[PDB]
Amino acid sequence: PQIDERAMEAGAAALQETIVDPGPLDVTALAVAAALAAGLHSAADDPAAALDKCIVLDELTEFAEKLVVHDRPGGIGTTVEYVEVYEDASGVRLGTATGNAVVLKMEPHMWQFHQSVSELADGSFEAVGVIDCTAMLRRMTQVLRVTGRSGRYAGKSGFMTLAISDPNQRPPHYSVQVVLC
Amino acid sequence: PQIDERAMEAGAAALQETIVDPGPLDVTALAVAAALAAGLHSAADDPAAALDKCIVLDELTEFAEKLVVHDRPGGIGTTVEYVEVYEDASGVRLGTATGNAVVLKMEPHMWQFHQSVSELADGSFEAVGVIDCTAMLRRMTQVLRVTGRSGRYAGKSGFMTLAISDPNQRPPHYSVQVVLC
Ligand SMILES: CC[C@@H]1C[C@]2(C)C=C(C)[C@H](C)C[C@]23NC(=O)C(=C3O)C(=O)[C@]2(C)[C@@H](CC[C@H]3[C@H]2CCC[C@@H]3O)C[C@H]1O
Numbered sequence: 001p002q003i004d005e006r007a008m009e010a011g012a013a014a015l016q017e018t019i020v021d022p023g024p025l026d027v028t029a030l031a032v033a034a035a036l037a038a039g040l041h042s043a044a045d046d047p048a049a050a051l052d053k054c055i056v057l058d059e060l061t062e063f064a065e066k067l068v069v070h071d072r073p074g075g076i077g078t079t080v081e082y083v084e085v086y087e088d089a090s091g092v093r094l095g096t097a098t099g100n101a102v103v104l105k106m107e108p109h110m111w112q113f114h115q116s117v118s119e120l121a122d123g124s125f126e127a128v129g130v131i132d133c134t135a136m137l138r139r140m141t142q143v144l145r146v147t148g149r150s151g152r153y154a155g156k157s158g159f160m161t162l163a164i165s166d167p168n169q170r171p172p173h174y175s176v177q178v179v180l181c
Numbered sequence: 182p183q184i185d186e187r188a189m190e191a192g193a194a195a196l197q198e199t200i201v202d203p204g205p206l207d208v209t210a211l212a213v214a215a216a217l218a219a220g221l222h223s224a225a226d227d228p229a230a231a232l233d234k235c236i237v238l239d240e241l242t243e244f245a246e247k248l249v250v251h252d253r254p255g256g257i258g259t260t261v262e263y264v265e266v267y268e269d270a271s272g273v274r275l276g277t278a279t280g281n282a283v284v285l286k287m288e289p290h291m292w293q294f295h296q297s298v299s300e301l302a303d304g305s306f307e308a309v310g311v312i313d314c315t316a317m318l319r320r321m322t323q324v325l326r327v328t329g330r331s332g333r334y335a336g337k338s339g340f341m342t343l344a345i346s347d348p349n350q351r352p353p354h355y356s357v358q359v360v361l362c
């Protein structure tokens with residue numbers, strides 16, 4: 001399968017940015033968010049307690065295995081179809097996510113609506129979000145809504161973080177975290 | 182209803198930033214996202230079609246009328262309680278929102294979990310999001326998930342945008358859009 005050059009070279013694009021402004025969110029923080037949103041946490045509870053109530057997928061990497069862009073003039077409504085693979089820190093494949101995106105806006109920041117279904121050994125979950133692709137190029141983290149569907153994830157919901165993690169790779173790798181409750 | 186000095190002076194804080202990087206969304210884009218998320222629209226239709234399917238609140242201004250901070254040592258888990266006013270472009274009051282936030286992370290970017298309920302003339306809706314406050318000071322737009330509660334908004338869902346709009350005010354003014362379907 002093929003990967004559009006814009007995805008292959010996205011890491012290189014990041015390296016040309018003059019704004020290099022990381023702002024990660026750790027999984028404990030993401031678990032507090034997930035538990036608060038699920039009404040299963042109180043902000044006089046302790047963060048490690050939120051983490052204990054959650055299903056946690058961290059120290060995950062993802063990158064594109066297939067990415068096709070269907071361009072429209074001016075870029076508005078351009079569509080993307082992708083399959084990405086999840087790997088652990090050691091490079092072991094854990095699963096895939098199959099999704100599509102729609103370009104909402106190009107300038108000054110490119111924004112995309114993303115929706116995907118992730119399939120791992122122990123179940124599946126959906127991710128949906130409105131993400132600032134220019135902010136990601138400038139190293140920022142973006143957050144998507146996660147809804148569990150099958151297996152271990154069923155009936156649970158939470159959040160996912162996405163950020164570029166190694167811009168020297170082609171295609172680049174992204175750091176991914178998922179917390180559900 | 183008093184307003185914590187950090188909220189009063191946040192516009193001045195924004196003006197001290199050296200990264201000034203706005204990236205807004207137009208409502209049509211936001212309507213495309215809302216309609217895609219709700220399964221009422223197809224990537225292959227045209228954007229103005231999505232706009233007609235939606236309830237649209239564009240060009241809103243908001244600012245705090247009350248804001249109380251309950252600080253926690255280290256900044257993480259600090260809570261915020263606020264009441265804000267909505268105005269249209271000409272300055273007519275449309276309603277209010279009362280919200281609660283929790284600081285998730287302080288550095289290198291401050292992140293907050295927000296949840297709020299907006300009360301307008303034709304009903305109420307809830308907004309929930311995980312937002313990068315540092316990105317906001319640097320002029321970026323943040324997106325929250327919206328769920329209608331009552332009236333016209335009931336049974337509808339979509340998105341809200343938030344960005345600083347006049348940092349010269351005390352407290353500063355924000356631009357808001359809400360689109361539901
Ligand atoms: C920063 C946001 C993007 C990261 C994603 C979300 C991360 C991951 C893990 C998956 C694989 C998708 C992502 N990877 C991509 O390469 C693209 C993605 O949406 C695109 O849409 C590109 C290929 C990328 C760049 C430019 C293209 C855009 C297609 C539409 C026209 C643009 O000129 C945008 C990416 O950097």
Ligand SMILES: CC[C@@H]1C[C@]2(C)C=C(C)[C@H](C)C[C@]23NC(=O)C(=C3O)C(=O)[C@]2(C)[C@@H](CC[C@H]3[C@H]2CCC[C@@H]3O)C[C@H]1O
Nearest residue numbers: 187188191243244245250259261263265282313314317355
């Ligand atoms: C997303 C950026 C924030 C804008 C909000 C979301 C916008 C609006 C319209 C409503 C009214 C709330 C907001 N306004 C604020 O002043 C605060 C808010 O969360 C705070 O939390 C402050 C008072 C602000 C600054 C510093 C404080 C923080 C409280 C916690 C300790 C921080 O040191 C952060 C704001 O820039």
